[PDB]
Fold:
Amino acid sequence: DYIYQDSISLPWKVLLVMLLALITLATTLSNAFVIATVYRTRKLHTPANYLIASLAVTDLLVSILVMPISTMYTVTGRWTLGQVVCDFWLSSDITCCTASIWHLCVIALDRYWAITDAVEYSAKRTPKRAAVMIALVWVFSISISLPPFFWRQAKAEEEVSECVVNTDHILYTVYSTVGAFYFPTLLLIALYGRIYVEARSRIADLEDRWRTLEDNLRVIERAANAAEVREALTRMRAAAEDAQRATPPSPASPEMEDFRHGFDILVGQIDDALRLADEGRVAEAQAAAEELRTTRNAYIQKYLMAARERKATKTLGIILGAFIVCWLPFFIISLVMPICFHLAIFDFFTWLGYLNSLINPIIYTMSNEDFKQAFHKLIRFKC
Amino acid sequence: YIYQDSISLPWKVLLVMLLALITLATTLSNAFVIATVYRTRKLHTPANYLIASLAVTDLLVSILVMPISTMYTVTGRWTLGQVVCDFWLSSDITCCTASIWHLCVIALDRYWAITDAVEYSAKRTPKRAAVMIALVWVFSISISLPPFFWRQAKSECVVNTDHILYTVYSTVGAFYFPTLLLIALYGRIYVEARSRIADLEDRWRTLEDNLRVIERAANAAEVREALTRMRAAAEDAQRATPPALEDRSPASPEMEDFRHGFDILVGQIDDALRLADEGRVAEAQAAAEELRTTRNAYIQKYLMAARERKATKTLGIILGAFIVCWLPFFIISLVMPICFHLAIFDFFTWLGYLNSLINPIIYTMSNEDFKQAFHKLIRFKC
Ligand SMILES: CSc1ccc2c(c1)[C@@H](N1CCN(C)CC1)Cc1ccccc1S2
Ligand SMILES: CSc1ccc2c(c1)[C@@H](N1CCN(C)CC1)Cc1ccccc1S2
Structure:
């Protein structure tokens, strides 16, 4: 029994409490940054952003209930706080960190329902629905941490020298590891590959509907009779109609209302250029095609931003990517620990795992343009 | 565009040849085991009954799954229709699931055989082994049952991706959960074995040093002090039961020989203590020379514990191979939806099936009962 913390000198001990309390703080500020931004901004009050808020709540509770106590226990190498504190430290640590994974999946589940059931769930999605999901996330995270302590009743010790999870029951060693990490993690990897292709699909959908509207504008311009024109317009009508069915979705930006109003305008123009041929004016419908092209240049160069909506999916992929690299090495290494300086690196991937609670809100700021401007506004880098 | 069409007929033939070889080798290997168990009277145990039902499982892969797979892989098309695609996946999922869970039920028996060695030796019957077999199959079934329960409501054969819920639940409950169970049950028993060898490897160091002492000892106080600690070492060696024999029957003939061997050696310590009371010391040093000869014969024979830890390691090679077989399938399966690629996905499916071959061949290579059973069959020995 040799604690390696003793070999590490006082200069580095200080640097490490400094560094870890920095991380602890950086996490306390970043997640507080998000929760305030959501609550204060009326624009952002959505069942979508509540999940994002309750995620930062969770990651904030790591920087509060877990991370500073870890800061002590990691640097020192001994647990001075006793048994009942060792209890709630692990309980909160598993529960918070569990809830942060399950808030991610409840987020991606809402994003799954926002697309596939876009028609259905837009009515179903209330704050109550977002709230009940949040409640079950915490409640599950609790009942993951609840089993170790029900069993602890047989032995009682006056003094405590160390605080790590119970390895007595293998049953709840696996159950926790999987139920808390593996299961909802693999869930998110599945919900990403799901929605990544969904985005890839609906963009090919509308890009093909654009090639319809693009080529048929060339047809109307080049068509020498009234029949080839209406033929183009009828294929443009059914294309704009089909394109309308598929919509990108969370705060729906003013620009996006403008591309949907850009379609109702465009369909308004297809209805007029048909009335123009009914009036018998063909070379006018070829001037109405010069018109549609200007509406195209107005709204569709702006629609070259549905291409951004697909990239807004990739950012959740980067969360998933970061999330994994953070926690997985812990869960890789934790199972090999009994067989396998080594205890130093186990302590490391716990912090690397806690580092997710920092990394989750900073991504939203970098990725999401709502928060980035909220961010630029606070420090005043952008007027 | 299906790439099976680009692959030429000569290689098509080599691949049905290779896969049907694997299909056969698996049909042969697992039948080899099941026959050996039933036929050998020595081997009839609830322990090997589990080992048999594992080979049963792996045999059903070489039957229900592998020859049908052999076709669908080489051609690239499923000609057999809907109701066949149903039972092919059902059997494939159920068998391959049962093979992971027969492994864990094996390691669960090995866990209860060691840690609860006192308790479970009475609890372990064939009935106890059998009910476990049943729940293994039953679980494996109810993993394959949901796709079909749900399709009732509403050219190629692959698993249902409609419910992401049961895409995951199946992937985890059938593979990830019990695999991680086995990795945990191995790290459990690997250290458990390391512990019981270290206990008695330390007891060896006690009785060795105290023999140096008594050989270098000049007094009755120093000798009797040595003898008391040698007695209590044998008594404290008796609280700890040995791992090779805990997996055996607790009352085995080999076990009584090491416990009676302790009673002999302690009986020898009782005379050399009584010898010091009479005032005879250098006679106890003729008695100490006597102790060394007896101890070496008994300890070199019990030095088969170097073997018990290694008999655990053979499950470690199974766990190791098993994972290397199936994991790449489960690595790739999650990356497939996003990410020529379908060629290698088909490959780790066969590499996964290759486990059904690799499981019984290990028992032969590892277990010395089968190795001799094998040499006898083919007439390897003159
Ligand atoms: C096999 S040991 C094990 C099993 C389950 C869980 C953990 C560790 C948990 N640790 C983290 C480190 N902390 C010092 C103790 C609790 C890791 C985690 C992370 C995120 C969500 C849920 C969980 S549950
Ligand atoms: C995400 S796709 C998926 C999900 C669950 C399972 C499989 C595949 C299973 N495959 C293998 C290939 N075979 C053609 C069909 C069944 C693989 C396997 C292997 C061992 C034990 C249980 C299982 S259950």
Summary: The interface with chain A takes residues 111, 164, 167-168, 171-172, 176-177, 180-181, 183-185, 187-188, 190-191, 334-338 of chain B (CB under 8 Å). Residues 10 and 16 of chain B are 10 Å apart (CA to CA). Chain B is about 80% helix and 0% strand. Residues B 89, 92-93, 96-97, 100, 159, 167, 170-171, 174-175, 326, 333, 349, 352 surround 89F (ligand 2) (CB under 6 Å).
